[PDB]
Swiss-Prot record:
Organism: Pseudomonas aeruginosa (strain ATCC 15692 / DSM 22644 / CIP 104116 / JCM 14847 / LMG 12228 / 1C / PRS 101 / PAO1)
InterPro entries reported in the protein's UniProt record: Tsi6
Protein name: Immune protein Tsi6
Organism taxonomic ancestry: Bacteria, Pseudomonadati, Pseudomonadota, Gammaproteobacteria, Pseudomonadales
Family annotation (Pfam families): Tsi6
GO-annotated molecular function: toxin sequestering activity
Function: Immunity protein that plays a role in preventing early activation of toxin Tse6.
Effects seen without this gene: Deletion mutant cells show Tse6-dependent intoxication with a dramatic increase in division time.
Gene: tsi6
A Gene Ontology BP annotation from the UniProt entry: protein secretion by the type VI secretion system
Length: 96
């Protein structure tokens, strides 16, 4: 799995949930923070600074641990892989 696949998983679940709770500011905030992490992964010119301002882990615990554990887990996975630095990720060579 790549970090982006985790982000995209979380995003799909947030979108699914938004179909049920279209107004929910918490989900809308989560969607914004995921999209930002996604853009950071895709574009090096984008400043990585604001990553420290993200609250996805806190949101999962406070809002979804009880209510929606599938979403909670997905948000936590996405937050973690999103703040992991570039330099520690793993690479597979062809033929290996
Ligand atoms: Cl969890
Ligand atoms: Cl790290
Ligand atoms: Cl790793």
């Amino acid at each position: 799995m790549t970090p982006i696949e985790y982000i995209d998983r979380a995003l799909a679940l947030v979108v699914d949930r938004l179909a049920r709770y279209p107004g929910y500011e918490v989900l809308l905030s989560a969607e914004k923070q995921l999209q930002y992490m996604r853009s950071v992964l895709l574009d090096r010119s984008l400043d990585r600074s604001a990553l420290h301002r993200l609250t996805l882990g806190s949101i999962a615990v406070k809002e979804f641990d009880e209510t929606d554990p599938e979403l909670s887990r997905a948000l936590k996975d996405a937050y973690y892989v999103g703040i992991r630095t570039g330099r520690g990720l793993k690479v597979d060579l062809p033929l290996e």
